[PDB]
Structure 1
Amino acid sequence: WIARTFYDGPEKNYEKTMAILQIEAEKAELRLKELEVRRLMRARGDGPWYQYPTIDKALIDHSPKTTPDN
């Protein structure tokens, strides 16, 4: 009666633990991958992150400058 009224079968806890383990293992893998990706982008600078600004090329004046040799 106690088991019927208050508790649940072993399979429920078993499968819930499987799901929790899957979720947290995926999270750990994603954390390692994030660290590696951050290191690579900061070292190289070829990704969307760590893009430090440079001078805009639309600021340059392309017109004769009173002197042929600029």
Structure 2
Amino acid sequence: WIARTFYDGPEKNYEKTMAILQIEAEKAELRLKELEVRRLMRARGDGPWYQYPTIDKALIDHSPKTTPDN
């Protein structure tokens, strides 16, 4: 009566543990991959991250400059 009224079967806890373990393992792998990607992006600067500003080329004036050699 106690097991029928207050508790479920073992398969519920078993498969819930399966789901929890899968989610946590995926999160751990994602954390490690994110750390590695951050390291590579900061070292090389060839990704969307760690892009530091440079001078805009639209500020350059491409006109004759009163002297032929600029």
| Fold match by TM threshold 0.5 | yes
Q: Which runs of 4+ in 1 moved over 2 A?
A: none
TM-score for the superposition, normalised by structure 1: 1.00
The structural deviation recorded for 1:24 is 0.1
Give the gaps of 5 or more residues in structure 1.
none
Looking at structure 1, the residues matched to 69 and 23 of structure 2 have their Cα atoms a distance apart, in angstroms, of 65
- Cα offsets for 1:27-64 (capped at 9, x unmatched): 00000000000000000000000000000000000000
- In the TM superposition, 1:14-33 aligns within 5 A as 14-33=14-33
Question: How many aligned positions are there?
Answer: 70
Looking at structure 2, the residues matched to 18 and 49 of structure 1 have their Cα atoms a distance apart, in angstroms, of 35
SS of the residue 1:17 aligns to: helix
